[PDB]
Design a protein around this ligand. Structure first.
Ligand SMILES: OCc1cn(CCc2ccc(O[C@H]3O[C@H](CO)[C@@H](O)[C@H](O)[C@@H]3O)cc2)nn1
Ligand code: NI
Length: 158
């Protein structure tokens, strides 16, 4: 089991960490959502699906920088919604093919009433999402740590 990002980098068997840059809507008002869909960027596969089933959860989602201070949010993982930052590990998604399949995670972030001006700075760390992988074969229990960075400034009009 390993993962990669689109035109990007890879995290190999056994886990590790990688940096991911996302495009964000440049202007977002109170009451609106920034939607950050990682399922178009992060892809994973099972290396021996004929005998092994891989189980994959969102172990934890954490907010940083402008997102931590200026937004509240929710995360959608494989069809279900949760608070973001997260309050517990999600249920598991099964990976049973050598063909790349998206990691089905999306953040929905909305400005708090005190956000104004530049609420997220270009290039800044905005979130960490930890993918936890196990299987039905041995004791493997691995973390794939995705550091999520803003590509551009996000302004909350005042
Ligand atoms: O007849 C038994 C047999 C065994 N195999 C492959 C053995 C194997 C063992 C571990 C393994 O590890 C990687 O691949 C596994 C499947 O994705 C994953 O669960 C592991 O954690 C790890 O990333 C891959 C192949 N093929 N046939
Ligand atoms: Ni592989």
């Amino acid at each position: 089991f390993a993962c990669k990002t689109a035109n990007g980098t890879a995290i190999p068997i056994g886990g590790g960490s990688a940096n991911v840059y996302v495009n964000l809507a440049p202007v977002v008002n109170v009451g609106q959502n920034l939607v950050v869909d990682l399922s178009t960027q992060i892809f994973c596969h099972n290396d021996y699906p004929e005998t092994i089933t891989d189980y994959v959860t969102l172990q934890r989602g954490s907010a940083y920088g402008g997102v931590l201070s200026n937004f509240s949010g929710t995360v959608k993982y494989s069809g279900s919604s949760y608070p973001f930052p997260t309050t517990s590990e999600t249920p598991r998604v099964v990976y049973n093919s050598r063909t790349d399949k998206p990691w089905p995670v999306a953040l929905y972030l909305t400005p708090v009433s005190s956000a104004g001006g530049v609420a997220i700075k270009a290039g800044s760390l905005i979130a960490v999402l930890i993918l936890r992988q196990t299987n039905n074969y041995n004791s493997d229990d691995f973390q794939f740590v995705w550091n999520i960075y803003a590509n551009n400034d996000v302004v909350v009009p005042t």
